[PDB]
Design a protein around this ligand. Structure first.
Ligand code: 2GJ
Length: 211
């Protein structure tokens, strides 16, 4: 249960400051990128299953589920993707991201839009447009379950998950929404965003509504 504290790569910290401290209007594009990242993770496990199906034993259902928690003020995006290993959390959210993170700001200096963040493979960091803190719970078939957490203060912590709920396989991403942005926890707002930005994705998008 030991927590290892790591620091963001310099370009990622530099980019993370550009997302938080700059004012943008349609911050709703974060959900498009988090669903798209969930869809890409779902693609990788079907392709792994085509090679070896024993990979779906962890969880046979492939879906994308959104769980807004108004009382906790969190938006959770759970998908049964291939998941990430402890190594992958550092090497997929870093190093591979460095070329894209730099290329994004090189495009942003050329006058690009914040919505193009997905074309540079760093669409996850757009979640900090609406989230003050992000808890990424992941589980890959060949590794253990880990909780990645960061408030974009230049440091991120990876914790081996031993007391949280089992995922089996996939990635559960808990976004701690800023108080002025609780609109992204409303039922109607989430759905009109999903239909607007993620209409044509192959996997089923699920929303947990509570009455
Ligand atoms: C290495 C094999 N495993 C995975 O790729 C994986 N499993 O779960 C992933 C999710 C990641 C995120 C954020 C933290 C990146 C989500 O919001 C949702 C996921 O399912 C997730 C993932 C999916 C896509 C990406 C970014 N891609 C896409 C753009 O190019 C770079 C790589 C990064 C991570």
């Amino acid at each position: 249960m030991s927590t290892e504290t790591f620091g963001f790569q310099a370009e990622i910290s530099q980019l993370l400051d550009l997302i938080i401290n700059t004012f943008y209007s349609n911050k709703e594009i974060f959900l498009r990128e988090l669903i798209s990242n969930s869809s890409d993770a779902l693609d990788k496990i079907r392709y792994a299953a085509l090679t070896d199906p024993s990979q779906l034993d962890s969880e046979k259902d492939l879906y994308i589920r959104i769980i807004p928690n108004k009382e906790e003020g969190t938006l959770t995006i759970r998908d049964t993707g291939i998941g990430m290993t402890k190594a992958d959390l550092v090497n997929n959210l870093g190093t591979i991201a460095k070329s894209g993170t730099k290329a994004f700001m090189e495009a942003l200096s050329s006058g690009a839009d914040i919505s193009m963040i997905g074309q540079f493979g760093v669409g996850f960091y757009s979640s900090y447009l609406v989230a003050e803190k992000v808890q990424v719970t992941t589980k890959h078939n060949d590794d253990e379950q880990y909780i990645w957490e960061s408030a974009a203060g230049g440091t991120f912590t990876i914790t081996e998950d031993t007391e949280g709920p089992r995922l089996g396989r996939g990635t559960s991403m808990k976004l701690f929404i800023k108080e002025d942005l609780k609109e992204y926890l409303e039922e109607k707002r989430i759905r009109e965003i999903v239909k607007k930005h993620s209409e044509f994705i192959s996997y089923p998008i699920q929303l947990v509504v509570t009455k």
